[PDB]
């Protein structure tokens, strides 16, 4: 029962190692599995270190594969992907049943946050509905990974310091007790505490700011100094702004701006980082650009 | 960054 | 009989896009349960007049409409449902066009011969004369198909009406017909072609449109390749050797794309005649592009010569191109020859190689850019087997150390895979002189590709250069690695363990590697507590029964214990592959 | 397989074999709310002048 499951999960993960999407009815059954998988967990899912914290994807499948050749593979290096691995890319579906076959074959060894761009409108209109309805003809799976999305949690805590959430900070909310008692089985609001941790980012501002994205708000030094304080954080770690070193500090050390899909829409050119605490909780960082194709 | 970046590069 | 049309308007006059899809993929069901005669009177004329602002729906209506032929009764009347193509081709989007040729394709193709000449001959010319360009464009691809099966008055007809199109003043047009001239030239003759497309195709090569003459050296390349060698000099070397020097650089890129092919059709002897000098005057124009192409050729180039003068000319003019290009700064076009110089490896020789290309080589591969040394070290094999091993081992050692170690981590895995080959070279002593430190050093790289390549070659290392040479020196220090407070060099003595325990014998890995191994077994990291189960399992074979069942067998037993549930699971899963319990 | 209303509309026998079909795709619920929608779908006339649907024999068919 288990066992032979396991097994023929262990097919899935090859076969997905090889670019090869699932039948749909295996996308189904996964989808299924991964509905009770999810449900057990918080919003702030504590997870331990050692991590390895990678940014955005936006689903570009040899970059992924590049990552996991830096990194390691998913079973022996644990890792917090941050949102946005489904959109503006020609490989998303691919990437996004792998990152979901992993979670499923190993509880604890990854984690996957919620970014922006999962969503039900976000992505019939950037591409992922597309994509899918290109692959496999229907929506049946659309329908099934957009339901997906919304079982995700919010933020990921390391030993009680890092605090990893893929937007930022929110006028509404102030300390993690908020963000324990929102509700996450709601596709993202257009406006509120949920939908501006997934549009919030850093500014030399100060104070606050209507977000030229059209949703969330800007945070300045002092508000995420002010936070950081509140609630003994030492270091936010956020990936939503396309970056050139691929890990840069914002907010004189207490944001850090990742991101990890390396030539943004295959022509910007970027490089991409990837950082990595290991169990004394001794940051590093790697950075990359794309494999050969 | 492009601008920096040179590429030659045409059809 | 009326009722499936009433239904059928309301479903696809709706909001959406996929009902009416679903629509136009249950047409056939509706067509063949209505009958042949229902659908031929009434369903046609009404897909005929309708029209869409919107393109999905023609688009698979278009597909449709190819196997709809059977539903309307086979060849035999595929006249009725010529109609409706025609109609349809006339689009203001280009790859309904696409899909309505093709379509135009297949219906050609299944078509009898004379209904073919009866009605699809004069629907074409209906098409071409078509004031709209786009109906011109889908009629130029039908000439092809359409040739085989009419009359020889009918060819002609249609050969005067090809050259009366491609004679058309917008290029809109001229580029579809010159694109469709070399699939054209493959149904006619060779006195055709002679008497009346190599004028007119002189004509557009002469054209002031890149864009035409883009296509034009492509239908030049497919009609050398369908004429003889003895015709060609007389009429498409002037083309090919004018289009080759026009001041626009794109037609010049694209011959340097497309030379291999001319090289070949022609023939060595036309290629040492005069095809060289022209490929050489690509080699120095200012636009990188054409010379970036024409680089990447080079190796495809030569190998395509005989050798009769075949180095005679490599020397003479290849290679005094090919130093200046690598002199050349720019990085793209650097780049792109790094990876094919080393392709005329094998080809100069052992001596010529040594003699001129080792210099050259060596001079790429320390340079600053790191395109160009990424892909230079790529290839390093191919110069491998042509020349022996100490030779240019010696030649590298200088540059071997720095290069060790630098930015990319791609070339450091080239040298990883290769070293093994340096060691066996230089025997023991010079590797534990210097190369052992590298290799030390590289069993701790930030990356993990690096660390997984460098365990493998340590691999390769210790079976090469024996046992107790590894008991000696590498096991005390790899083993010695597994108490750092990271937890990454704890995973790389483990698997490393996992790699050596193979050829390290039994005796050592029992009281060097196990001894380590099995106290590892505690360490308050989850990931280590499971992938020491991991290592345990492949080790396992290479025990004795009696250490196993006294020592191992509690460790794992113990593991199973813990509370991680992904351990246990490994604990179980190596417990029963070895079958200790 | 996916068989919509229009195959049962245009041929009855379609409907017996789809219920006879060990795993009718779509389910025999799906068909009534397809079939009753169709049948409840309003009637707009020529000059967008929204009425309920006429109880015609497509109607019929589609209730029966
Ligand atoms: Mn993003
Ligand atoms: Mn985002």
Redesign the pocket.
Known sequence: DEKVFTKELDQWIEQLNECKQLSESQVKSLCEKAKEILTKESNVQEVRCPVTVCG?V?GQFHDLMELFRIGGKSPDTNYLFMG?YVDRGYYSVETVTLLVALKVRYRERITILR?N?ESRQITQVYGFYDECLRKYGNANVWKYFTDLFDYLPLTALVDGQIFCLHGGLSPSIDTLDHIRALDRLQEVPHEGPMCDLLWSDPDDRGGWGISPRGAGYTFGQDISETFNHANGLTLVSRA?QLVMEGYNWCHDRNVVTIFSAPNYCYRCGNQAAIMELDDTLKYSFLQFDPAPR | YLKQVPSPLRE | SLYPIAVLIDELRNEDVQLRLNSIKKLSTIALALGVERTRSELLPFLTDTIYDEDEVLLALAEQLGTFTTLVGGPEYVHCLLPPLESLATVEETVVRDKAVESLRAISHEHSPSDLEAHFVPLVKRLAGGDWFTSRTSACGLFSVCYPRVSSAVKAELRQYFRNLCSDDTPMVRRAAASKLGEFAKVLELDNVKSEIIPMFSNLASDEQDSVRLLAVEACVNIAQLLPQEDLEALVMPTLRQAAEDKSWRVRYMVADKFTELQKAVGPEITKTDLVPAFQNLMKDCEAEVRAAASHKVKEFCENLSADCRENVIMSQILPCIKELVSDANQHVKSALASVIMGLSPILGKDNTIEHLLPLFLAQLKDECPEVRLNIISNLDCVNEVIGIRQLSQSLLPAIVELAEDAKWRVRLAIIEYMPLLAGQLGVEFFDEKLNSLCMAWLVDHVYAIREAATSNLKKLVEKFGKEWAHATIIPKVLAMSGDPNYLHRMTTLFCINVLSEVCGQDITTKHMLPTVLRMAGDPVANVRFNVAKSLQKIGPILDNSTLQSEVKPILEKLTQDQDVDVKYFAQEALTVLSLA | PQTCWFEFLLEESLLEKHLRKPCPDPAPVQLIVQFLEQASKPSVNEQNQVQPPPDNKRNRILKL
């Open positions: 955005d936006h946005d970014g761009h939503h």
